[PDB]
Design a protein around this nucleic acid. Sequence first.
RNA 1: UGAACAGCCUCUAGUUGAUAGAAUAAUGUAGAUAAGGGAAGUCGGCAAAAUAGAUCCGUAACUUCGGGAUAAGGAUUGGCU
RNA 2: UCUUAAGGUAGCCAAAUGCCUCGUCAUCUAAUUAGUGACGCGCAUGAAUGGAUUAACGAGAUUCCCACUGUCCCUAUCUAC
RNA 3: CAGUCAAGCGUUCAUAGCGACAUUGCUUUUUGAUUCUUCGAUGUCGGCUCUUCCUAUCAUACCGAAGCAGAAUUCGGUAAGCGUUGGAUUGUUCACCCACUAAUAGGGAACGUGAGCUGGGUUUAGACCGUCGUGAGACAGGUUAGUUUUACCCUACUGAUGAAUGUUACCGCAAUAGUAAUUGAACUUAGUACGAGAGGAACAGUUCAUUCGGAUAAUUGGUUUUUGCGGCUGUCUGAUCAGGCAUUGCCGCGAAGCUACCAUCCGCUGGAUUAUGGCUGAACGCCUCUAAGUCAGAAUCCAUGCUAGAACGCGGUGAUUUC
Lengths: 61, 386, 136
Amino acid sequence: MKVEIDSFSGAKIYPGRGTLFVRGDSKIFRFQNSKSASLFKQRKNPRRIAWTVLFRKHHKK
Amino acid sequence: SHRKYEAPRHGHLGFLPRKRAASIRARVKAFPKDDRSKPVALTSFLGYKAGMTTIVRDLDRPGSKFHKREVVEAVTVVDTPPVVVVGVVGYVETPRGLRSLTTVWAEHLSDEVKRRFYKNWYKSKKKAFTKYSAKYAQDGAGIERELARIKKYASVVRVLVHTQIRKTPLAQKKAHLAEIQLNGGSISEKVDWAREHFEKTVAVDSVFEQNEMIDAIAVTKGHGFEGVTHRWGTKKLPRKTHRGLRKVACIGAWHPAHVMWSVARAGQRGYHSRTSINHKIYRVGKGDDEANGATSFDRTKKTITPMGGFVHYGEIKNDFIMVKGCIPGNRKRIVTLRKSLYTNTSRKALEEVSLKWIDTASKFGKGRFQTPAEKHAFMGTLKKDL
Amino acid sequence: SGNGAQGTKFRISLGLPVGAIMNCADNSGARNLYIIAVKGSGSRLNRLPAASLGDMVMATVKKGKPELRKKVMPAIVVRQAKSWRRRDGVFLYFEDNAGVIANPKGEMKGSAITGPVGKECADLWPRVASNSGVVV
RNA sequence: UGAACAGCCUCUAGUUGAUAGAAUAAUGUAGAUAAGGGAAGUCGGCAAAAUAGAUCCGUAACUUCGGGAUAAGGAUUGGCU
RNA sequence: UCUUAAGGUAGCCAAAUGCCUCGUCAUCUAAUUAGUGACGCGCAUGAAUGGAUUAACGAGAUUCCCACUGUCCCUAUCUAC
RNA sequence: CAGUCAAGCGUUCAUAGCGACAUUGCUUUUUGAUUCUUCGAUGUCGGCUCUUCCUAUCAUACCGAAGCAGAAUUCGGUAAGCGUUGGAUUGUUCACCCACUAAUAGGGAACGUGAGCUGGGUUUAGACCGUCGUGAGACAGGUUAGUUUUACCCUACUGAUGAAUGUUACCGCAAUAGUAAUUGAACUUAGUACGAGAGGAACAGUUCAUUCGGAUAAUUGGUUUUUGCGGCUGUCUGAUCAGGCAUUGCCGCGAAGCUACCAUCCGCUGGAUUAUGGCUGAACGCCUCUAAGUCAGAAUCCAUGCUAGAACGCGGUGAUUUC
């Protein structure tokens, strides 16, 4: 097995934990918790949410 | 007339009456069969439920879809400090059932068991078993006579045990004191086994081993007074219901001119003595050992304690049992462990279980790591980390 | 399943009770389906026949082709969008929920599939994983 | 603020009265929320929820030629310069 | 072929009026004693005992659609009293 | 509802299954018949709910007979353990369909059940229309609208305490009482047996599911007064930071908590049996499951296992108070 990355925020998802959304064009999204899951259903931008690893990468910390 | 659609009885009659059971400790209503071929050892144990968790293992059954592929399934943690055997009692059978005749103790007894006997430790004259020790402080002078009496008679000898309430991280400081029917060997072997084991620690890795079909005996967590629909499973009433929708509508016809026993109705729900069967112990682990939550595939030193510890309980510095299934009882609840009553296989009882990964995620919420070294390696330094 | 069972269905937690209008996924000429029964259902008093992914069902296409509107016909759900627990501890879901028309043996009446399918219905109905684009 | 003697907050003025206190079971009365499905529940969509202002785009049948009509069905609205 | 003073003309119809009656057919729906359009010996429709028709209106009565929803599948949770 | 006789049907054969003419009966769900009771009121259809009961079996278990090659399907026997559904229209009981099903058995408890619901019906008063009547009005002829009262008592029930066995604490026993797990499908057996072919089985083993049940919250999903963090509005504290109020101001997240076949686990095995088939063996020197004896077996029954402990059934152990 292997430990994974949040499709929104970029964090290790130990299995047993999390949910997995698939879009109609078959896009596979993983979410560790309902914070990231509800924020993606609110279409929040990962480059704007200030605790995301994409925020971490876009602001170089 | 006749009931316009047939439906089941809502609820199970056999668990009537649904009262609060007697004690915080569960009674035990059966034991394994006595047989002289098995050597003299226990049939049970008393441990505590400390928290639940969920581990990753391999399924190996020839015919599933997930033969030799990954699964992850719920387990339960019972803190099992090796109990101090002191004393034993004797039962002889009659057509009036069994009857006790004798209770022998050890010489020195602990503060925990004498705080079980006391009710006001803060005001006591510490007068427990003193004339009993006066019958002791000798060789066998008023002891070996009842010992040979038990040898001469007394078909069932039960070891008395008491737990290590100082070693549990609670704040109860009062020991539980219960019994185990010895169903190994013959009777003289049982009694001198106990005579040896007077004031002696007996352990779970000595009585049990892995892949074992065990039983749990517990009084389930209390839930107060109760409505009829959640107490028994009844379909609710519509919105237009003058006087109440969480009710059972009829309670009987005209004649029987009473409320029948089976008719669902309020009462206590919860705090009930139950006994469940068919578990498998997935780890016997040691508190005097690191890497408690480490499997064969991981091999990284991590204890079974989560970061921040189990909620309402804490640390598992004792020995522990990690067993399959939803055993009843909450955290901090004394639960009585037991071996089987039947030699089933089902091609299930004998499956070799491989340990692969253990969720040590933070039960205080939804944890994102397993290890504080992992957490510091991820987030780097912080403001608090100078 | 009925007859179309090369492997049985481990319980996929129910997410489409009777009356549901689940979308049509094929090239048959239908658009959306209306669940009218469940084959292999339960029976509990004042309890709907609730189906899940891969349950062979009866359905009516409410809307489309005149020779495919307004009749009784078998169907196979391929997408649920009610999150269920696989044996290995993963809860997945969709946002669309859909099925295909089938015959009472199990081949699709339509020779295509719009969209993803599930691993469960793939293992459970082999003509789908032939006719699917992707599989998850 | 606001279209406004709407609803909300405050000034002046008057009041701070209506049995309390302790725990917060069942069932209530009043509030709300709910994942997938969407009358299948029910006699009956009762209850409840969903649309809701302003601006602009646009508007059927029928008509007593006045209406229907805010028909329907969409879009934007905050702040700062 | 008789008769009553004249013997239902324009219309409407299983209608708030139809016993049989859940009329026949069409539509509606997977499925309809409902609704809808027709047919007419219509037990017992019909002309200010007012007939028919109708825009707009209506806390009237009724069927379907769309959105909508704890009405239900199947319940659960918090608050005030 | 169930029998007796057998004219016949059943290709030939009364009884495989049926069965005319006659016949003897049995239940109270009919519907009558009666008017014994309540008219100083027994709340009144139907539905929603909920327990229990009948066997005159629809399915499940075991079997027996078939016009049983096999598949299916018909009859009969034991048993009431377990199950008997989602909808359409109808106020409906019933009906008639669409399906699901292993199967959609009959029925009861004051035509169960209204201080349990709802109020569509019927069953007042408003109003129409139709037919009759000179009118008043009449109509189980149509339709629309029409307030559904009290529990704090006693008893039952479900849970709770609780004085009296020298006191007190602990460990148990078990007299008693209820009992539950139930039902399919896939593979393989096997295109095997079997069958001219077409067709086409069952036992065992493995793997999941339906219905009930009982737990549990690790994850998931639900709930927000953690008013915990953040955002937004209007007004008030001169301004900011901070906040006051809008009967929890709204909204996103959110622990702790509680909670769903909406989450996961789990539902033990020994015996005595009935129908049924037999062994030995008479009476009845042959024979025979029967008369005496005896074997095998059901979801039965009794146990195990479970469920509270007789609060007047018991056992053991411990310590039992002085200036």
